Design a protein around this nucleic acid. Structure first.
Length: 112
RNA sequence: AUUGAAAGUUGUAGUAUGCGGUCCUUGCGGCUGAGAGCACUUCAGGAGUUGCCCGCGCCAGC
């Protein structure tokens, strides 16, 4: 319904909304607490159509589950683009080794 | 009003006194309203249905 440029700008705004997410701007009591934040590791998949939800990082062996859910999804015929930070994720998987959070957002907005 | 004139055929009298139509007598004895009989046989309370969607326990706290 809206102009295509409006849709695009909304897309990059939503993607860049993650910049004040992994920097320590979550939760409440920011004035006094402002928690000591660091991103230990992360894995992201972009794709274009419907893809299965990634496994939560709560579990201890979620890296193996992520590898198994990525390789087989790509084998099934999904054009999934994978970005990894501080996660090996094997060697046979074409995954972009990102270095931070904002450049991950740059990679996401590259494919708009 | 004369073959006429006056002239009770009358008085008293229980056809009565007593006397069980009576005595004895099972309408009685024996007798299955009885024997055989599925109110049975076949039946989905069934198909479809998000208890959904939005939500800072929040901001000032030597």
């Amino acid at each position: 319904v809206i102009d295509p440029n409006e849709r695009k700008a909304r897309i990059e705004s939503a993607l860049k909304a993650l910049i004040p997410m992994l920097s320590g701007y979550i939760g409440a009591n920011l004035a006094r607490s402002f928690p000591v934040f660091k991103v230990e590791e992360l894995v992201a998949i972009a794709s274009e159509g419907p893809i299965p939800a990634l496994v939560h990082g709560f579990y201890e062996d979620y890296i193996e589950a992520n590898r198994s859910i990525i390789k087989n999804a790509r084998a099934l015929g999904f054009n999934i683009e994978v970005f990894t930070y501080n996660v090996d994720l094997g060697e046979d998987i074409e995954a972009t080794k990102v270095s931070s959070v904002e450049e991950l957002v740059a990679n996401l907005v590259k494919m708009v």
